[PDB]
Ligand binder design. Structure first.
Ligand SMILES: Cc1cc(Br)c([O-])c(-c2nc3cc(C(N)=[NH2+])ccc3[nH]2)c1
Ligand SMILES: [Ca+2]
Ligand SMILES: [Cl-]
Length: 223
């Protein structure tokens, strides 16, 4: 997260860190046994780390659970990143409490101007790499579809939306991929891609979760 602030320990209880010997992507807990992340964060050997604040220190509240299976959307296109969503089933259910809690899926899509909270342990520098130890947060609005398409002509599908600042300086970045974009208490986006990080007129692009709620429910119900 570039231009964001320190969230504060456990203030984002649905945030998870996907780990393979190091943090490589974020994710959101939607119930005690399932996490939603981005398809491009897929790899085998994933350990889901819940209740984290400093990812390099065991401070208490952490729950480390191995992934039992990861389900990448069947129509995921790695070249366009269209359908960039993945579900991860945990080997055992997590213990939910005030520090580890799930976030609700939306019933309707959000409108442009909606203010959302984006969080993650991704890079904090737009020109260079500085990875933080604690969770960073950023409040960012959803942009209109015309501004989004004007910024990325021919690359925005109906399963994506832009959120951020066109002046540059505040944005999600590598390492934040897979994490949550929460607006009014509902998970509306998943950190997916963008051109560089925090560059002027190149806002972040997010997977539009409201388009996948029936797919997530049906897939969870059959697995
Ligand atoms: C080299 C590399 C590898 C991976 Br895997 C990423 O997810 C990314 C990446 N760049 C990103 C840029 C943004 C942004 N909002 N500007 C968001 C997620 C990103 N993820 C970059
Ligand atoms: Ca820790
Ligand atoms: Cl277009």
């Amino acid at each position: 997260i570039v231009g964001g602030y320190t969230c504060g320990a456990n203030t984002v209880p649905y945030q998870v860190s996907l780990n393979s010997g190091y943090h490589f992507c974020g994710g959101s807990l939607i119930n005690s046994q399932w996490v939603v992340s981005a398809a491009h964060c897929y790899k085998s050997g994933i350990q889901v780390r819940l209740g984290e604040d400093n990812i390099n220190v065991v401070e208490g509240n952490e729950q480390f659970i191995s992934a039992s299976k990861s389900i990448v959307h069947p129509s995921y296109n790695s070249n366009t990143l269209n359908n960039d969503i993945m579900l991860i089933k945990l080997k055992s259910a997590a213990s939910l409490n005030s520090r580890v809690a799930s976030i609700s899926l939306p019933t309707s899509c959000a409108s442009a101007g909606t203010q959302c909270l984006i969080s993650g342990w991704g890079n904090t520098k737009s020109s260079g790499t500085s990875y933080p130890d604690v969770l960073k947060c950023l409040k960012a609005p959803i942009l209109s579809d015309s501004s989004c398409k004007s910024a990325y002509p021919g690359q925005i599908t109906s399963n994506m939306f832009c959120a951020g600042y066109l002046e540059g300086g505040k944005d999600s970045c590598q390492g934040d991929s897979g994490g949550p974009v929460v607006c009014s208490g509902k998970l509306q986006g998943i950190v997916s891609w963008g051109s560089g990080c925090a560059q002027k007129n190149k806002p972040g692009v997010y997977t539009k979760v409201c388009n996948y709620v029936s797919w997530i429910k049906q897939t969870i119900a059959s697995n």
